[PDB]
Amino acid sequence: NSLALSLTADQMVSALLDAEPPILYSEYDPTRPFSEASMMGLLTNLADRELVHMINWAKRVPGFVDLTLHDQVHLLECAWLEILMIGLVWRSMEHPGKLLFAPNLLLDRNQGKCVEGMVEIFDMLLATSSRFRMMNLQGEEFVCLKSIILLNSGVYTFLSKDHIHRVLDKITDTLIHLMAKAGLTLQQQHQRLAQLLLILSHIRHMSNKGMEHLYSMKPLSDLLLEMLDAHRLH
């Protein structure tokens, strides 16, 4: 039924690379000293625009379109901040000690102090970026991890699931294929697979702490508000 399971390993990689969202810019406001509201306004506006491309990117993930409309809404609602964070961590990789929110908005941990409780999450985001840099995470591996987060974050909350798990196995096969082609031994292949997947737990943690501050903090658009409102089970 699903065309995603028939794709080869290379067909999976090139489809994920081609579907990558564009790197957006922040406002070119030269007022480099940020207040608490100006800091929050830039990030909120950037996130509000990144979501539209994320929804487009999600529909190009192999097998995602085969899910029902309710299943797609649920996965995006549960994982959207995780997906933003791993994107932020990925493009901040070549800038140690810095977070590259946009090419015209590169922040350090000192600038995160403008908002309370944010400098703790900056340090976690920086620590994830540094960890990816020490592992030499490749772009082909990044797009596999980001797809996994999309399909795995809400698959165990479907209750009132088998097709998702088959797609997840496919992406796993794709990750191993990338590590064998890069020359890693068999032992190094499963050790690197485990290390990358263990980082997804920390990303989940970062997303949860961030949500906890975001719905306590609440101008965000109605789309971003409905994504945040979905995590108000507390």
């Binding site: 539209v52 929804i55 409309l69 809404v73 995006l76 789309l223 409905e226």
Partner: peptide, 10 residues
């Protein structure tokens, strides 16, 4: 009615 619905099909 959610904006996510209209975004996932338009």
């Amino acid at each position: 009615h959610k904006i996510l619905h209209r975004l996932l099909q338009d």
